[PDB]
Amino acid sequence: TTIVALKYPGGVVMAGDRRSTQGNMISGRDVRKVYITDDYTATGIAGTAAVAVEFARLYAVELEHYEKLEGVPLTFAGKINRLAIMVRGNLAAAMQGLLALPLLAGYDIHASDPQSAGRIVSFDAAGGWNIEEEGYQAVGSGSLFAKSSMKKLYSQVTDGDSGLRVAVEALYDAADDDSATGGPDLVRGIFPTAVIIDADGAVDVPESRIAELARAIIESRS
Amino acid sequence: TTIVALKYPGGVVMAGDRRSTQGNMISGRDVRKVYITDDYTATGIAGTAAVAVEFARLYAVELEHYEKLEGVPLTFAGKINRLAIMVRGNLAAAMQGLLALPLLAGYDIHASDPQSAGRIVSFDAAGGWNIEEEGYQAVGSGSLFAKSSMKKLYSQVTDGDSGLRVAVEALYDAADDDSATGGPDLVRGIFPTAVIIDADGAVDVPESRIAELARAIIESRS
Amino acid sequence: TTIVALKYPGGVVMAGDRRSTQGNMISGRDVRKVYITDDYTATGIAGTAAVAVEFARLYAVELEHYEKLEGVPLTFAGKINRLAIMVRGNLAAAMQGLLALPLLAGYDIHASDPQSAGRIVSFDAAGGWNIEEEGYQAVGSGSLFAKSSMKKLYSQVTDGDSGLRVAVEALYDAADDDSATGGPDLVRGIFPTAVIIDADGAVDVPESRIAELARAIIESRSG
Amino acid sequence: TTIVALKYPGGVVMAGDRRSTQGNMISGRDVRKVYITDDYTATGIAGTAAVAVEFARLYAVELEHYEKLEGVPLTFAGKINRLAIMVRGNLAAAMQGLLALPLLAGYDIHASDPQSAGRIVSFDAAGGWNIEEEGYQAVGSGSLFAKSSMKKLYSQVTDGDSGLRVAVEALYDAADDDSATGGPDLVRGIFPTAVIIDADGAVDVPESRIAELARAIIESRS
Amino acid sequence: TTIVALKYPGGVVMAGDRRSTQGNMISGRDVRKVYITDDYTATGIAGTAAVAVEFARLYAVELEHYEKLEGVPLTFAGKINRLAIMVRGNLAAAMQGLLALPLLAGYDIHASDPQSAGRIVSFDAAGGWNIEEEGYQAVGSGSLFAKSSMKKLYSQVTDGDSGLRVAVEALYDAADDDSATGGPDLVRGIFPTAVIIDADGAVDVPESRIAELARAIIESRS
Amino acid sequence: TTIVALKYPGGVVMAGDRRSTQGNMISGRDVRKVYITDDYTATGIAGTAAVAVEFARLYAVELEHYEKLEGVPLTFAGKINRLAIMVRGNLAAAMQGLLALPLLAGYDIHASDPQSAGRIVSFDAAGGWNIEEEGYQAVGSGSLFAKSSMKKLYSQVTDGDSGLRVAVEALYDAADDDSATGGPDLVRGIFPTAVIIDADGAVDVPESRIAELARAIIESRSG
Amino acid sequence: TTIVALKYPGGVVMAGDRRSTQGNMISGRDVRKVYITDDYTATGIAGTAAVAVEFARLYAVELEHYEKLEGVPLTFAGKINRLAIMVRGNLAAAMQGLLALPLLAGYDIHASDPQSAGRIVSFDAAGGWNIEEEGYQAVGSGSLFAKSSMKKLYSQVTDGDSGLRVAVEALYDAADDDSATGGPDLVRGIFPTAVIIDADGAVDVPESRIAELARAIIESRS
Numbered sequence A, B, D, E, G: 001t002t003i004v005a006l007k008y009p010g011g012v013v014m015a016g017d018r019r020s021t022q023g024n025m026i027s028g029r030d031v032r033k034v035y036i037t038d039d040y041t042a043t044g045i046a047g048t049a050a051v052a053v054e055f056a057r058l059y060a061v062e063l064e065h066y067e068k069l070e071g072v073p074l075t076f077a078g079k080i081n082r083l084a085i086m087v088r089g090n091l092a093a094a095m096q097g098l099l100a101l102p103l104l105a106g107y108d109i110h111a112s113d114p115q116s117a118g119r120i121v122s123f124d125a126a127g128g129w130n131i132e133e134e135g136y137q138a139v140g141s142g143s144l145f146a147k148s149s150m151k152k153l154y155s156q157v158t159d160g161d162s163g164l165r166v167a168v169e170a171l172y173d174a175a176d177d178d179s180a181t182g183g184p185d186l187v188r189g190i191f192p193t194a195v196i197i198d199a200d201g202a203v204d205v206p207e208s209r210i211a212e213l214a215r216a217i218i219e220s221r222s
Numbered sequence C, F: 001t002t003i004v005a006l007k008y009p010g011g012v013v014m015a016g017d018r019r020s021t022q023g024n025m026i027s028g029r030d031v032r033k034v035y036i037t038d039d040y041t042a043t044g045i046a047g048t049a050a051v052a053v054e055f056a057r058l059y060a061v062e063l064e065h066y067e068k069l070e071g072v073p074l075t076f077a078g079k080i081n082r083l084a085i086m087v088r089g090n091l092a093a094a095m096q097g098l099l100a101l102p103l104l105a106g107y108d109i110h111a112s113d114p115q116s117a118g119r120i121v122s123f124d125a126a127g128g129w130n131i132e133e134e135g136y137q138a139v140g141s142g143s144l145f146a147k148s149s150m151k152k153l154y155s156q157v158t159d160g161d162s163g164l165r166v167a168v169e170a171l172y173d174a175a176d177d178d179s180a181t182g183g184p185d186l187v188r189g190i191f192p193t194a195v196i197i198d199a200d201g202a203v204d205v206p207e208s209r210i211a212e213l214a215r216a217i218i219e220s221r222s223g
Ligand SMILES: O=C1CCc2cccc(c2)Oc2ccc(cc2)C[C@@H](C(=O)NCc2ccccc2F)NC(=O)[C@H](CC(=O)N2CCC[C@@H]2c2ccccc2)N1
Pocket: A001, A019, A020, A021, A022, A023, A027, A028, A031, A032, A033, A045, A046, A047, A048, A049, A050, A052, A053, A097, A098
C-alpha cells in the first residue's frame, strides 16, 4: 500500500493505490483505501485489510455519532484524538499481525487562515499522532518512495489540479519501486483513487481525471 | 520469478521474467534468468539471485569442462545428473535461504525422432529430477499460474513462433498474479528473455520479437 | 531526545530538541517536547512519542482538575508525586517499549527563598523521583552529553538569559554527539523550544531569541 | 552510511558520507568510505566499520597482486567476481553482525565505446552482483532516499560536474532523512568524499569543489 | 547503599550514605536514606530507589494512621510486624527488581528494662524479621564491610557520641570497599545522614557534627 | 575504567585511572592501565583485567619482535594494524565476556610535521580502528564523561604540561560520574598514571606532578 | 574456605582453614589447603577440591621442572605468569563448576631489600593476576570477612609472629561469619595450617603455635 496526502493553497489532496496482496500473490486490484470520513475529512489506511476497512468504517460512524449527539461536529483536534485512541486500542492485535496504520487529511473550517486550513496528520502503531507541517505525508510499504518523490515535486504544487497530479505521480513512483503498491492498470482501466477537500468539503476525484494524469506520467517516462 | 519451458514440433523454447526483489522492494528490472548452457541446452533458475547466477555459470563450465576433457559432450541424461547433483549439494545452504531451483530445456541430438528430441526437465530442492512428458513445465513463484495458463493454451502450439507466443503469454499471466514476477515494461522497453532450441542449436530470441508478442497480448487483453 | 533544565537566580529554564525518529529514519523535525503544564510548571518528556505526548496532556489535565475541584493548586511536592505515580503505573508497558521519562521544572510559590524557589525534578522508569540540588538536569538519549556540558558551562548562569544560553548550548552538544537529538536547523529555521518560569509564571521563549543564541553558539564554534 | 554512484558521458562518479555511529551515538565525523581500489576502479562500502575497511584494503591488494603476477590487470568482470566472492565468503560473519556491503564503480578501458564505458555494480550480503544499467545506484541505510533523489535529478547529468552535483545532492537528501548518514558539516568543514573516473583514470575530487556544491545545495534549499 | 544501626548506653544510632547509582553511573549525591518514622523510630532502606522511598513514606503514614485512629502508638512489635508485612507484600515485585530492604532502629518506651530499651531489627526480601541482640546491624551492598568494621570498633561505644563516630566509620569502611556506597565528599561538603534515638525521642544529627567525625576519621586514615 | 589520550604541540599524553572492580566491590586501587609499548607508543586498555594485561604484554613483545628480526621498527600504520588484528582475533572471547578495548597513543617519527606528529587511535571490539583527528579520545566506562570534559577544556592545551592537566581533569570528571573509574585517593596518595610521548620518546609522568595537578583541581572545585 | 596472606617486615605469612563441604554437609575436617610449592613460595587454593589439589601438585612440579632443566629457578614474575596461565587454561571447566582460585605468597630473593621481598599475588577465574600492595589478601567464600578483619588488625603486624596472630584471627572471623570456613576445633584439636616464608625459605608453621594463638583469641573474646 501507498497512500499520499499533500496540502495545496486552500485545500488538501489524498490519493491511494488499489492493490491487496496475500504474500507474493496479488489478491486484489480494485481496493478503495481512501475514505471520505466526513464532509471535511478523508482517511487512508495501510496494513491488514480486515482491520483497515473496519477502522475506516468505525471512525466515520464515531465522528457522525458525536455530531448527532451534540449538534456540532468535533473540532479537528478532537478528530485526531479519536483516531489516535482507536489505533492505540489496537496495539496488542497489531503486534499479532492485525495492523492498521492511518493517515488523516482534513480541512479545518475553524482555522483562521483558510488558505492554509488544510491539515495532514500521520500516525504510528502505538497511537502516536503528528500534525505534518512540511506539506505532504505518506503511509504504507511504499511511503518512503512517495515522500522522496514528493520532496522533488512539491514545488510544482500551486492549486488543486497540480496537487492532484503530484499526488498521482508519487503513487506512480511508489508502485515503480514497491511491488506491494499497485501501479495504474491500463489493460483493466483501474487507477488510484483520490479525495480533494477544500472550504466546500470533500469530494471523490472522478476516475477519468486520474486516468488522464496516469497516462500522462506513463507517456512522459517512455 | 517465473521460468517457462515448452515443446513444439522440432524443438523447445524457454522464457523467463526480468525481476529481482528484496522483500517488497524491486531491486532489479533487467535480470537475465535464462542461460544458453551449451549449443543444445538452456537453463533457467529461480531462487536466491546469488546462488542462481553461480549455479548457471558453474553448470555451463562443468559441461564444457567434460567436453574438452573427453572430446564429446555429455549425454543429455548426464547433463541432467550433473545439474541434480549440483542442486543436491546445495540442500543445506538452501535450507538456510540460499536456494536455487533450475529448469532445464534441451534438444537431444542422440534421440530417435528429431521432432521429439525436445527435452524439458524439472528439479526440486532435494536434487530430484523429472523428465517432463506432458509438454511444458515452469519454475518459480509464479510457476503454478504459468502452468495453468499453459494448460489452456498449449493446444495452439504448432510451431516455433506459436510456442514462443504461448510462453510469453504464460509469463504474462504469471506476472498478472505473482508480484515477484515481472510483467512487460512498455515504459522502459524491457521484456522477458527467451531461448529457442532445435536441431540447429540454441539461439537467443531477439527482443523485438518478444516485444511484438507482448504488445499483441496486452492489446488482446484490453 | 534531550530535554534540559537549569536553575538561575529567580527562576528556572527548560529547553528541548525537535526531532523524532523511527530507527535510523528521521520522522519529525518540529516536535515540541517541553510543555507548560501549569502557570509555574514545565514538563519535558523523552521516550516513545505516543506515550510522551499522552503523559504531558494527561498530567496537565490532572493538575488543573485538582485546582478547579479544590480551589487551590497542588503543592509542588504534590505535583511531583502525581507525575511519579503516572510513571510508576506505566512501568509494565514501558518494559514492553512504551516508555516515558519526564523531567520537571517549576517555580514553588510557597518556597522559603524566592531566589532559590526554582525546582528541578528528575525521574526514572520505576516512578522514582529526585529533587535536584546541583542546579541542572537532563533526560533523554543525549542527557549525559548535556549534563557534562552544563557541568562546564553552569558557572556563567547569572540570570534568565544566560541560563537560556547555557541550555541551548547543552542541547547543541547533545545533538553533536547523539543522532537521536536534533540540532538547530538553519536551512529550515527550526530551533529547540524553551520555557522560562519565575515569580511571574511560566512563559514560552520566543523562537527569535533561541535562534539568535543558536547562531551565536554556531559561529562561536565555527570560528 | 550512504554511498552513491552514477554514470555520466565518459565516466563515473562515486561519493560517500563521513559518519560512523554506535547506535545513537556519533563515533566518527571524518570517515572515508570511498576507496580508489585501482587506477580505473573505486569501491564504496557500507556496514560494520572494521569489516568495510578490511574489505577495501584486501580487495585493492588482491587486484594489484594479480596484475603484478600476470603482467596485466584483471578484466572488469574478473574484478566483479573477486569482490563478489569476497562478500560471499563473509556471509557467516555478516549474519553475526560483521556485515560489509560494497558498491563498485569503474571505467572499462576495454569497452569499445568510451562514452558508455562507465560501470556501476551493486552487491548483496550473499555475494550476488548486478551490473546497473539505469545509470545510478546507492548502498547503505540512506540508499533509498538517495536513489529516489537521483531518480528525479539524473536527467540533469550531462558531464562530470553535473554528475558530481547530483551525487552530492543525493547524499544531502539521504542525510536529510537518515540519521546514520552524515550531512555536510559547515561548522567543521567536513564534506562527503568523492572519486571521479574517466579514460584518464580515477582521481579524488578536491574537497573545495564538493564544499562549493554543498553550499550551493544548502543555499538553494533555504 | 549502606545503612548502619548500633546500640549505645540508653539509645540507638542509625546512619546512611548519600549515593544513588544507575548501573556504573552515579545518579545522586545527596540522597537521604534514613527516615524519622515516628517520635521513637527510624528506618533506613536500601534497594530500588523508587520502592525504598515509597516504603519509608507509606510506613510512616501507616504508623501515624494507627496512632490517630486508636489514640495510642503501636507497640514496637506491632511496628515490626507491619514493616515485615509490607516487605512480604512486595516480594513478587522484588523478584522483578523492585526490591526494598529496610533496617529498623528504635527506642521502646514500653521496654521491660528502661536501661536496655534500644532496638535494632533487620529484615529480608521475604519479609522475615530478626531482633538483633549483638548491638549493631547493617543493610545494603556495603553491609558486610560495615558489619565487619563494627565488629572490631564496637568495644569503643561508650556513649551516644562514640556510637555516632563508630557508625560513621563503619559507613566510611563500606564506601571504601563498595562503589555503590558513597563516602564523605569534602569538595561538595556532603556527608552521611544520621538519626539518634534515646528516651527523649529521635532527632536528626546536625551535619556539622557528622562532618567533624568524618574529617577526624579521614585524618586518622591518612 | 577511563583512559584518556590527548594531542598537544609536539606530542601526546595518555592517562588512566587505577581502579578495578568485581561488580560493586572494589578489587584494586593501584592498577596501572597505561603501558609504554615501545619508545614512541603507549596503549591503555579497558575491559576484563586478565585480557587487558595479556594484550599489553603480548603487543609490546610483538612490536619489539619485529624490530629485532628486521632491524627497524614498524611504521605507525603497521603498529595500528597489529593491534587491530589482535583485537579482532579476540572477538569471540570478547562476546563471551573476555573483553579488551585498547586506546593507542604514539609519536610518529616519520610524520611530515613534527608538531602534529602525535597520534590517537581508537578501537572497537570487532577490530575496527580509527585515527582520531579531533585531538582527544577516551575509552572505558567513563569515557563519555571524559570526552565531554575534554571537549570543554581542550582549548587550554598548548604544551605537554597543560595537556597533562586537562587529561587529569578529564579523569577526575569521569570518576566524578562513573563509580567504575577511581578518583584521586588523597588518603592513600594514589593518583592516575600518565605517559607523555614526544620526539625524544615515551616516558612515565612522575606521580608527584600528577598529585600536584589533582590537588589543584580539587582545590579549585572546592571553592 | 578462607585463605589469608600477609606481608610483614622481611617475610610473608599464609594461612588457611581445614573444612571441605558438599553443599550443607561437612565432608572434611583436616583438609590442608596451603602448599609449600617452592622453597620461597606457598600457594593456597579455594574452589573445587579436586581441581585445587591438582593445581597445587602440578604447579609445584612445573616450577621444579624448570629449575632442574635450566639450573636456575624461575623469577618470581615467571612463577606468577605460570600460575596465571594454568588458571586461564581451566576457565572453561571453571564455568562448568571445576573452579580453582589460587593465592600466591612468596619471598623474592631477587628483590631490592629483604624487608620488601615478601610478595602477595591474587588471581581471578579468568587468569588475571595482581601483585597486592596493601599488605594482605584473602581468597574463598570467607575472604571478605577476613580482609575486613585484617584491615583493622594489620597495624599490629611488625614481625612474623604478630603476622601469624593476625592471620589466625582473620581466619577466625571468617569462620565466624562463613559456614564454608572451618573454625578452630578444640574438641578434635584441628586448627588452621600456616606457612611462613622469609630469607631462610618457606616453613610449615607448627600446629602447637597455631593452637596457642587460637586459644588466646577464643579466650580474649569470651
Ligand atoms: O493475507 C491475508 C490473510 C489474513 C491475515 C491474517 C493475519 C495476518 C495477516 C493476514 O498478515 C498480513 C498479510 C497481508 C497483509 C497484511 C497482513 C497485506 C494486506 C493488504 O494487502 N492491505 C492493503 C489494503 C489496505 C487497506 C484496505 C484494504 C487493503 F487490502 N493484505 C491482507 O490483509 C489480505 C487481504 C486479502 O487477501 N483478502 C481477500 C478477500 C478478503 C481480503 C481483502 C479484504 C479487503 C480488500 C481486499 C482483500 N489478507
